């Protein structure tokens, strides 16, 4: 009921890194404090590292196990955007703002970071556990994928959106907004594929899949809170970032056809500003 519509929306959102000139960001970048520059670098590396997993494994593995030519095509298109567009865009932002040695060090740090690794490996673990012709394992991976697309990225997206809403780092903020817009539709689409599997299950199996999804969400959420304090306490933003995580967790759940888990909260206004045919047989007419 939905793949051709998503095909259309995906292809009409096509864009390339070269379209946004990045050099003019240096005119606001130079005015940020060390903590602001540090947080931005770390957030950016976090997003980059997670998105690479999605391009190399997440989207291609789902495309492999999903049946249907049109679904495989949409999924291929999404994988292309991760690898050919998003990955180049993140690299471009980095190369503009930091010298080569600084980029290498930030990636070394974020690669060793406990909270980034915990979530990255949790997601990758579920992708690696998909078994041929087993729709339950596929569903679990789709849940992981939706959580990445619609939830885990947002502790990171917060900061570029926060600057973007203030008139700072506008070129890279425009790029991030385009990336985020792609991840939103990716999350919604994979969510619909997961609901299709979920709806084919018994009531007991459904309850079991719901428990899986909520348990996974809880593990990721508790790690996000730690990840958030680790990055944002130094710039005083953690309280507001936490509200943004919960709001996006609720969107991820709704993508999977589940009820919101967290109470509704208002979001930081600066970030908001950034954002069976059968024939009649001639006797059916007589009674």
């Amino acid at each position: 009921d939905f793949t051709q519509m998503f095909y259309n929306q995906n292809v009409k959102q096509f864009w390339l890194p070269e379209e946004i000139a990045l050099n003019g960001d240096l005119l606001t970048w130079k005015y940020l404090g060390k903590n602001e520059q540090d947080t931005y670098m770390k957030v950016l590396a976090g997003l980059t590292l997670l998105d690479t997993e999605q391009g190399n494994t997440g989207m291609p593995i789902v495309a492999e196990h999903v049946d249907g030519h049109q679904r495989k095509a949409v999924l291929n298109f999404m994988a292309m955007m991760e690898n050919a567009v998003h990955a180049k865009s993140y690299s471009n932002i980095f190369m503009t703002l930091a010298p080569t040695e600084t980029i290498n060090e930030v990636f070394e740090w974020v690669k060793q970071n406990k909270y980034l690794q915990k979530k990255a490996q949790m997601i990758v673990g579920l992708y690696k556990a998909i078994q041929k012709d087993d729709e339950i394992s596929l569903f679990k991976a789709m849940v992981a994928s939706v959580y990445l697309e619609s939830f885990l990225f947002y502790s990171g997206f917060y900061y570029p959106l926060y600057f973007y809403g203030q008139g700072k780092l506008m070129q890279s903020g425009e790029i991030i907004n385009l990336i985020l817009r792609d991840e939103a539709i990716h999350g919604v689409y994979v969510g619909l594929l997961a609901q299709e599997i979920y709806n084919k299950q018994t009531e007991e199996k459904k309850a079991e899949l719901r428990e899986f999804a909520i348990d996974l969400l809880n593990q990721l959420y508790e790690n996000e809170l730690e990840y958030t304090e680790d990055l944002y306490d130094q710039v005083g933003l953690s309280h507001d970032v936490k509200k943004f995580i919960r709001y996006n967790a609720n969107k991820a759940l709704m993508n999977l056809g589940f009820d919101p888990y967290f109470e509704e909260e208002d979001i930081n206004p600066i970030v908001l500003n950034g954002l069976t045919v059968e024939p009649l047989k001639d006797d059916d007419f007589y009674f």
Partner: protein, 683 residues
């Protein structure tokens, strides 16, 4: 999770292998004591509450100014004296979430059930304190439920119209199409559902001013109307809902039906517009014989004969149209079209089916016009006349649109109180008042028809509930016997009240003299046949209540001939969905879909057992999907023989049923005199 919601969820927790039905009373009590009493605004006296409500632009002061405050206090005491208690959590939840007046911030509760009942009764009485007390007793006893628009909006300053169902005739011209779009938007802005008849529009590929192939057909107008309804979606609180009806013999029938195919292109697909098909007996006859059929171009017929195709008798004019070289027609396969209808209903539940000859063989106002289409709920069947909207600065020829204000009898409560006559007459009075106080100043045909025809719809609900609580199977012959007797009595007393109103006001409805009531042909079956219960068990249910006999019907016929009738149409059984929870009743006359209703409100799931459900009546609360649709058709046909308008008839289908089974159900309904089929619901 709220405490009351936890108590309600204990309903499903089986104890001793039995549902804990008593947990719902505890759930409702907890709900009240913990939320409703807390969030209910406090007023020292009724005078202060009334002053606060009037000054703060909550109530209309005009209707309350017709009573001395002593009379208002007496009416409110009458409402409160009953000490009415909601029997289930869902009833109180629905009332206090949908109909209970809340502060402008939707934070506190300003009205209780008694307050709303008293305000509605005072609005109905129009300055009569004793009449207001009678209305309060009727509503608090829950013998009568005014339609959701009337119940919610009566006596409120910031209210929509009390009438929520409108039918619009569309003439074949750009002026008429634009006026139809404007009227649909105006009526949806008022919250009412709008049904449009598109059978007079010429088919795709017809000439516009002697230039051929210029017309877009009914599908372009359908796209226009769908966008108009989407735009005027009631400020976003309720998406604009409209229905389009096309005669099956219209050339655009296949394109019209294809707008509801899932595979349909987004350009042709219509998303928010319901579609119904008007099937004359000629189409069913053609399909039965497997003969090749023809669909006609309406404008060619209009030019050849000077009349619209849907204004003519298809059963007589079909052969003439086929033999006329100046009439353009397209060969079709009638059985293929029937199977397409069945498959489309299975996939989406559309289109609605209106059996035109079933509607008009008993139609009392064929002199005014034949019934050509139905409303958005498929229970409104009245004569309409198309308006001629001309160019600016010219005079418009205003015709007759269709609108009726609805009310539902609570069958269980009416039968328990043995008050069919009193309840029916009071409901007729309230519906007449609602019609009289209604004035739409942007739908000239609707306003004119409301003033001229004085049409009301008096429905019924809790038929399955009442039968199950009395140990009667919905599909049993005893249930049909009870329905026959009860609805015969309802029709008798509604006709008597209409005649009494006509005598009191010394005025009938426009063109009454030509109606079957005036000539007496309406009462033929009532004066020649008896409708008293044929089963002793059903006859006992009516003990203490006078069942009108043939002599009573003859006396009523003479009375109507002497005084006439005030209402062109009186009875129509609308779906009555939202207010069924408040009334604690089964929706309309349909069988229950599920014994216990599982709903999600926020993140909390609520459990609603069928009203009166228990271990001893579990078997009688049979779900609709498990019933024989032929028996449901038999029940609806038994009821429909006493309803002047239609009955909103939903078909409940199992997923294993093929399109052939749906077609057989449709053909049996047409055979059994069914007028309209509302929805094809599949499990």
């Amino acid at each position: 999770v709220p405490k009351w919601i936890q108590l309600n969820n204990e309903i499903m927790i089986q104890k001793d292998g039995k549902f804990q039905f008593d947990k719902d009373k505890e759930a409702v009590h907890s709900y009240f004591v913990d939320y409703i009493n807390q969030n209910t605004v406090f007023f020292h006296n009724l005078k202060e509450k009334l002053d606060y409500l009037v000054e703060n632009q909550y109530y209309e002061e005009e209707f309350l100014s017709l009573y001395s405050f002593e009379d208002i206090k007496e009416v409110f005491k009458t409402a409160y004296a009953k000490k009415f208690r909601f029997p289930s959590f869902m009833s109180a939840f629905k009332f206090y979430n949908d109909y209970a007046l809340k502060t402008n911030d939707k934070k506190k509760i300003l009205e209780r059930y008694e307050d709303r009942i008293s305000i509605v009764a005072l609005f109905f009485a129009n300055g009569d304190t004793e009449k207001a007390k009678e209305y309060v007793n009727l509503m608090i006893n829950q013998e009568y439920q005014p339609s959701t628009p009337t119940f919610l909006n009566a006596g409120r300053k910031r209210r929509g119209e009390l009438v929520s169902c409108f039918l619009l005739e569309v003439n074949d011209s750009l002026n008429d199409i634009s006026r139809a779009i404007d009227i649909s938007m105006q009526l949806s802005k008022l919250g009412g559902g709008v049904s449009l008849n598109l059978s007079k529009l010429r088919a795709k590929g017809e000439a516009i001013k002697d230039v051929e192939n210029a017309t877009k057909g009914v599908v372009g107008v359908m796209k226009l109307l769908d966008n108009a309804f989407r735009y005027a979606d009631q400020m976003g609180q309720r998406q604009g809902s409209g229905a389009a009806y096309l005669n099956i013999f219209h050339r655009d029938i296949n394109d019209f039906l294809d707008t509801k195919k899932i595979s349909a292109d987004e350009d042709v697909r219509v998303k928010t517009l319901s579609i119904g098909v008007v099937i004359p007996d000629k189409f069913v006859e053609l399909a039965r014989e497997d003969k090749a059929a023809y669909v006609f171009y309406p404008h060619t017929i209009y030019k050849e004969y000077g009349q619209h195709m849907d204004e003519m008798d298809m059963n007589e004019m079909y052969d003439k149209f086929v033999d006329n070289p100046r009439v353009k027609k397209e060969k079709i396969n009638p059985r293929k079209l029937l199977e397409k209808l069945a498959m489309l209903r299975s996939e989406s539940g559309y289109p609605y089916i209106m059996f035109q000859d079933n509607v008009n063989k008993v139609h009392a106002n064929n002199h005014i016009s034949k019934v050509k289409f139905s409303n958005l709920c498929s229970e409104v069947l009245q004569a309409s006349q198309v308006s001629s909207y001309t160019d600016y600065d010219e005079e418009d020829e205003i015709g007759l649109d269709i609108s009726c204000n609805l009310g539902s009898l609570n069958i269980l409560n009416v039968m328990e109180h043995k008050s069919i006559e009193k309840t029916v007459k009071l409901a007729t009075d309230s519906l007449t008042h609602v019609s009289e106080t209604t004035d739409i100043r942007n739908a000239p045909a609707v306003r004119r028809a409301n003033k001229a025809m004085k049409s009301i719809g008096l429905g019924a609900m809790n038929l399955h509930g009442y039968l199950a609580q009395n140990g009667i199977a919905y599909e049993s012959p005893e249930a049909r016997d009870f329905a026959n007797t009860f609805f015969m009595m309802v029709n008798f007393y509604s006709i008597q009240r209409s005649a009494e109103i006509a005598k009191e006001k010394g005025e009938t409805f426009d063109q009454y003299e030509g109606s079957t009531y005036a000539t007496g042909e309406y009462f033929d079956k009532y004066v020649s046949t008896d409708f008293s219960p044929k089963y002793e068990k059903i006859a006992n249910l009516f003990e203490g209540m006078h069942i009108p006999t043939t002599e009573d019907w003859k006396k009523l016929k003479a009375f109507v001939a002497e005084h006439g009738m005030y209402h062109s149409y009186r009875l129509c059984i609308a779906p009555t969905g939202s207010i069924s929870y408040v009334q604690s009743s089964t929706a309309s006359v349909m069988p229950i879909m599920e014994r216990i209703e599982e709903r999600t409100y926020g993140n909390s799931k609520t459990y609603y057992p069928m009203p009166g459900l228990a271990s001893n009546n579990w078997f009688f609360y049979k779900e609709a999907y498990d019933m024989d649709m032929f028996k449901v058709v038999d029940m609806i046909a038994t009821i429909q023989q006493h309803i002047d308008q239609g009955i909103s008839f939903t078909l409940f289908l199992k997923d294993t049923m093929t399109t052939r089974d749906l077609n057989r159900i449709d053909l049996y309904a047409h055979h059994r005199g069914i007028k309209t089929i509302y929805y094809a619901r599949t499990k």
